[PDB]
Design an enzyme around this catalytic site. Structure first.
Site, mmCIF file in Angstrom:
data_model
loop_
_atom_site.group_PDB
_atom_site.id
_atom_site.type_symbol
_atom_site.label_atom_id
_atom_site.label_comp_id
_atom_site.label_asym_id
_atom_site.label_seq_id
_atom_site.Cartn_x
_atom_site.Cartn_y
_atom_site.Cartn_z
ATOM 1 N N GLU B 66 0.887 -1.402 -0.006
ATOM 2 C CA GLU B 66 0.072 -0.009 -0.080
ATOM 3 C C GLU B 66 0.966 1.243 -0.010
ATOM 4 O OE1 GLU B 66 -1.816 1.645 3.444
ATOM 5 O OE2 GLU B 66 -4.054 1.619 2.301
ATOM 6 N N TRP B 88 -8.207 -3.079 -0.134
ATOM 7 C CA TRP B 88 -9.024 -1.799 -0.824
ATOM 8 C C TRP B 88 -10.073 -2.363 -1.616
ATOM 9 C CZ3 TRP B 88 -9.583 3.363 0.284
ATOM 10 C CH2 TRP B 88 -8.467 3.896 0.827
ATOM 11 N N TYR B 114 -5.718 9.474 -1.109
ATOM 12 C CA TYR B 114 -4.394 9.250 -0.640
ATOM 13 C C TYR B 114 -3.389 9.745 -1.592
ATOM 14 C CZ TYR B 114 -5.808 7.198 3.616
ATOM 15 O OH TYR B 114 -6.372 6.971 4.980
ATOM 16 N N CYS B 174 -8.178 8.488 6.323
ATOM 17 C CA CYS B 174 -8.273 8.227 7.789
ATOM 18 C C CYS B 174 -6.969 9.001 8.581
ATOM 19 C CB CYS B 174 -8.312 6.734 7.822
ATOM 20 S SG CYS B 174 -8.483 6.216 9.667
ATOM 21 N N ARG B 194 -7.879 10.428 12.005
ATOM 22 C CA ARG B 194 -9.075 10.911 12.722
ATOM 23 C C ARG B 194 -9.992 9.909 13.324
ATOM 24 N NH1 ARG B 194 -13.068 9.202 9.308
ATOM 25 N NH2 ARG B 194 -12.361 8.678 7.355
ATOM 26 N N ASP B 197 -9.845 1.911 14.836
ATOM 27 C CA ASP B 197 -9.881 0.761 15.479
ATOM 28 C C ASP B 197 -8.487 0.323 16.090
ATOM 29 O OD1 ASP B 197 -10.150 -1.887 16.504
ATOM 30 O OD2 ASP B 197 -10.942 -2.943 14.863
#
Lengths: 288, 288
Positions: B66, B88, B114, B174, B194, B197
């Site tokens: 990634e 994804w 991103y 995120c 932001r 988990d």
């Protein structure tokens, strides 16, 4: 052990931590700072409390007038100077602008800073006398809609960090973004401050987001919760250590309380005359 | 008092704090959470150390692939799927796209997410097969220039948070931003996440920015310093508490180390075959 104002006491412990565990650097000017990269603290906003530091006074008129000016979307520093608020004067003056190559920029035209991004992100900046109504993303309006209509959202963010526009700003935003959060009828806020002096800009921005959170809570019909202040380069000037050691030995007073003295129609409907600050007690001035 | 891997131990303490002090959002898609708003932790990157958690294994291949994909500016999830990295896949599939109104977009076209923002902030997104050279702000190139030329800078920031483009993304990012910092020949990084988990996305993003910081340090001829991980909504799922408790009793192993096995011309010159991960020892999978 226990302090009347534990939140401010914890701030003083951050300053102490920087002095003890930070790293001394000298920049290109020979200017010495002591810094920790990465800090975080929290402040209770309940019952009207606003975290206006008490061990070293904070320029309340500056906080309040700047924040209303941010909200208005203005980028004209002259509007603050008209109110005898001079905090942006140096950053907008002829010399500062010309050094940046902004040789045709009107004095006080800060470029597409803060409030332009908050109310008009993505709009085409022209000057600080231009009507941008309807142009760009009104992030502040969006945040308010999210808080009211989608309070569980993990996406309630406002930012002035606009890479496309940085080159026209007199400087990049220092408080780069904030995130709001709602739980049990209470509104919380976390800001990110990329740089700041624990003796000046940190307390100033702490107060400004305290005020903003209380204002937004009123607009949204919620109670204030917690303010989270996150720092990047948290620093003190090495030449101020004596003044800081004075501050550190003072016992904080209880924070003052904010009071809004009329109803407001929206976030755009606040005026200085109706923002009251109750019971701000502060220690004396600190010499050189 | 101190542990072999104190940095991971402090992460465990964060999880324990959420369980003890956090607030619940109950539901019954079996998805209730327990949360704290505002957390921060630090991780030493000295001597190659990369903070891949040891008490619950992190999907390293996913992290690595990634990040190389982000750096490349890609927004085509199919490129990850071709590497057997499926993280994804659901956010790019036909049904997910169509439910957002992206009815004409190719499966796997995630929108201006991103990597597009990192390399082309402000460019006009078309699709995940378009050249964007010279278009938008190459924030990653700018942060590398600043690290090299202005290591004192308090302005070294990269962000995917683009209000103008959020509506075309499958998800808003995120990890919304990061800041770099240089001291004593060492590169540090702070990310802002932001939401996440603690059991999945938080460790994954921890590892990804650890890798990024090592990569940028190599490009810039610096040593790695510290990674600071700042959270907004830090949460766990209430149906994983039993597992979490087992996990929290585990003694962390030392973190693994990153090794780059050839020189690189630039940040764009890494390949998966030259990023080695040494000694990633983990505790077993918790069955439940």
């Amino acid at each position: 052990q226990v302090h009347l104002n534990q939140d401010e006491y914890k701030y003083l412990k951050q300053v102490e931590q920087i002095l003890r565990e930070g790293t001394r650097r000298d920049d290109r000017t020979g200017t010495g700072t002591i810094s920790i990269f990465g800090m975080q603290s929290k402040y209770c906003l309940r019952n009207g409390t606003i975290p206006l530091l008490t061990t070293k006074r904070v320029y309340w008129k500056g906080v309040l007038e700047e924040l209303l000016w941010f909200i208005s979307g203005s980028t004209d520093g002259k509007l603050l100077m008209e109110k005898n608020v001079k905090i942006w004067e140096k950053n907008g003056d002829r010399a500062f602008l010309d050094n940046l190559g902004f040789t045709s920029r009107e004095e006080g035209d800060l470029g597409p800073v803060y409030g332009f991004q908050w109310r008009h992100f993505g709009a085409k900046y022209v000057d600080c006398h231009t009507d941008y109504s309807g142009q760009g993303v009104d992030q502040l309006a969006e945040v308010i809609r999210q808080i009211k209509e989608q309070p569980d959202s993990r996406r309630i963010i406002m930012s002035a960090w606009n890479p496309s526009d940085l080159g026209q700003m007199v400087l990049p935003p220092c408080h780069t973004m904030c995130q709001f959060y709602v739980d049990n009828g209470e509104l919380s806020c976390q800001l990110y401050q990329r740089s700041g002096d624990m003796g000046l800009g940190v307390p100033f921005n702490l107060a400004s987001y305290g005020l903003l959170t209380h204002m937004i809570a009123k607009v949204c019909g919620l109670k204030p919760g917690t303010l989270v202040h996150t720092l990047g380069d948290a620093h003190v000037y090495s030449n101020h250590v004596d003044a800081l050691k004075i501050q550190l030995d003072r016992e904080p007073y209880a924070f003052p309380k904010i009071r809004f003295t009329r109803d407001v129609a929206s976030i755009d409907d606040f005026t200085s005359d109706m923002i009251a600050l109750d019971d701000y007690k502060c220690h004396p001035k600190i010499p050189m």
